[PDB]
Design a protein around this nucleic acid. Sequence first.
RNA 1: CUUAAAGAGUCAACCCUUUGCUUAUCUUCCCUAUUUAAAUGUUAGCAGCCGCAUAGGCUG
Length: 59
Amino acid sequence: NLWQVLNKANMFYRIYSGELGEELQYLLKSCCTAKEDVTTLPQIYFKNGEGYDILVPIG
RNA sequence: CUUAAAGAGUCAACCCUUUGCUUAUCUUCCCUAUUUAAAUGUUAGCAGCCGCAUAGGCUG
């Protein structure tokens, strides 16, 4: 699948630095998005100096 | 307010059987245990006889 080919011989960094094309850089980055959901995830408090931040640790 | 917050692992059982660790052995020679000295500590608390005494006295 795409997971094997993008992960050997540093192929994801090769598409990321555009040795195989800038329009491919676009295709890669079109899939590289940040989708967010905080349900069923741990939510802890970390001290940031006179206050706390709710950190949601993702692996 | 801690990768916070939350959670039933349950069940079941035939390890079997078999067997030759035998064989032969020099332990061995050696040689100073020597010398003293208070048993003291009263070292015994007896035998009769005068008596109701297992109270108290006397006799040696």
